[PDB]
Amino acid sequence: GAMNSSNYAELFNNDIKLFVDDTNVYRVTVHKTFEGNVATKAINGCIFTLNPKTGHLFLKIIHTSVWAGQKRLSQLAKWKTAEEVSALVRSLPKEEQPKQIIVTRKAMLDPLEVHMLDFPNIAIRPTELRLPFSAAMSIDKLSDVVMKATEPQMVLFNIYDDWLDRISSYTAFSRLTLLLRALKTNEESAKMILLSDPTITIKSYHLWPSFTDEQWITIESQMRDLILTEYGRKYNV
């Protein structure tokens, strides 16, 4: 059934699972036409598919050409996502295929269920968590590869960098979700917090700065402050 706060530790057991988020697949800018009407211009997207135990981010870039001449693009987008997840599973050796795929929006269940009829033993599940994966386009390197793509293209990163060498999946997922939630709530302040100190660098294959343990604690504390504050500024408290 649905994934919620009560069965949260299942994410970190040894059953392979993926999270799939489709928020950023179909993206537009809205602008005025010469005649004073409004039109959209699509920009590149991505499917955010993530193994929460290993940190593997299978990032599938969606190039604007995929929409050309199509109607009902918000609905097509959900199916286009399901088609790509399905192709990804089929590309993986059997022992690497997920036993469960958890979709972050309920509108994805039927498109993915239908694309995965070939895989009756893969459970397709929703969640009651309000996960901040839509903020993934606030991660500079992810946004850069998405925006520069001139064709469809799959890119790979470990969203946990090398963290698992020192911390558990559980803690690594909790850090990731705190960083994303902060980037979603106040992007500028979140980024200032991460990059203020020029001496902490981001390695070439990594997405986040190379913080020591003590520095991650400071950072984590500063993101929690941010999220509590903006929640006052937003609700005046």
């Binding site: 088609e83 239908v114 694309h115």
Partner: protein, 300 residues
């Protein structure tokens, strides 16, 4: 006109013949039902006074033999049976008519209700859904489950309706996932109509049989089947025109006949709102939509 005599009425029972019904008191002198119109299927059903649980009855066609009802005190139900001795049967029926111990099938001459609710229902097809080939009549009751319900437990006593499942490999062509799921014309026209049912009369015949079993016996799985077969049509962008015009009539009469107080359990809010207001065929069921909105505007 034909006759279904009864040996006796040993227990108090509400007897139904098609859309009509009447109360028989324990050991009342009742010897059966006369003037049954030839040329249609019929259903004679029972609800005991002591146990409103278990409605049951018998689908039959008087052209396929001489049938009678006889209470069985071991199994405790009114059983349909066939008499093969045609002379014995006529003699018995004549005796009972002379003494006037039979109720008359009470058809009004303006009334085509039963015809319109059974137009495509044929005994030979009923017998394939209700597997019991040693009898020319078919027993149904409230508790019998469907072949798809047993997939989701006794196979001999099930209803073998045609399995319809919108999220199945049969319904969905590789490479047309979104196309085939949002627009079920492939599945209706090629898989089901050309492939399984062969024509729209047989399709409509299962649909009508499913509806009647739902109404008369409160059979939950028949109710599911009836809604399924409606939804498949309504969710197909491409449907022969004659089938839509007939579907509208079919449903019109089913809605007209449904007991007003049973609407809450026999009608699925989601299916009907989808069919009447969101589906490809939302503008195609003028008679059905008009009676639905005037009789059950609550459901919508």
């Amino acid at each position: 006109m034909n006759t279904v005599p009864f040996t006796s009425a040993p227990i108090e029972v509400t007897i139904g013949i098609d859309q009509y019904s009447f109360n028989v008191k324990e050991n009342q002198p009742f010897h059966g039902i006369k003037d049954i119109p030839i040329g249609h299927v019929h259903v004679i059903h029972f609800q005991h006074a002591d146990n409103s649980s278990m409605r049951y009855g018998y689908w039959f066609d008087c052209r396929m033999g001489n049938f009678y009802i006889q209470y069985d005190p071991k199994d405790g139900l009114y059983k349909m049976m066939e008499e093969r001795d045609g002379a014995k049967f006529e003699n018995i029926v004549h005796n009972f008519k002379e003494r006037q111990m039979m109720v008359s099938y009470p058809k009004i001459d303006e009334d085509d209700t039963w015809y319109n609710l059974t137009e495509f229902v044929q005994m030979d097809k009923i017998r394939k859904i209700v597997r019991k080939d040693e009898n020319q009549f078919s027993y149904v009751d409230s508790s019998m489950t469907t072949v798809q319900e047993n997939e989701l437990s006794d196979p001999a006593h099930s209803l073998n309706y045609t399995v319809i499942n919108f999220k199945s490999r049969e319904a969905i062509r590789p490479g047309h996932e979104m196309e085939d799921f949002l627009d079920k014309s492939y599945y209706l026209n090629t898989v089901m109509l050309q492939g399984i049912f062969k024509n729209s009369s047989n399709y409509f015949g299962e649909l009508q049989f499913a509806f009647l079993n739902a109404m008369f016996f409160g059979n939950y799985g028949s109710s599911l089947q009836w809604h399924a077969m409606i939804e498949l049509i309504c969710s197909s962008a491409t449907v022969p025109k004659h089938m839509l015009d007939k579907l509208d009539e079919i449903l019109y009469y089913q809605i007209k006949t449904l007991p007003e107080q049973y609407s809450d359990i026999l009608l699925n809010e989601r299916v009907w709102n989808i069919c009447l207001y969101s589906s490809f065929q939302k503008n195609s069921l003028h008679n059905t939509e008009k009676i639905m909105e005037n009789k059950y505007p609550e459901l919508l």
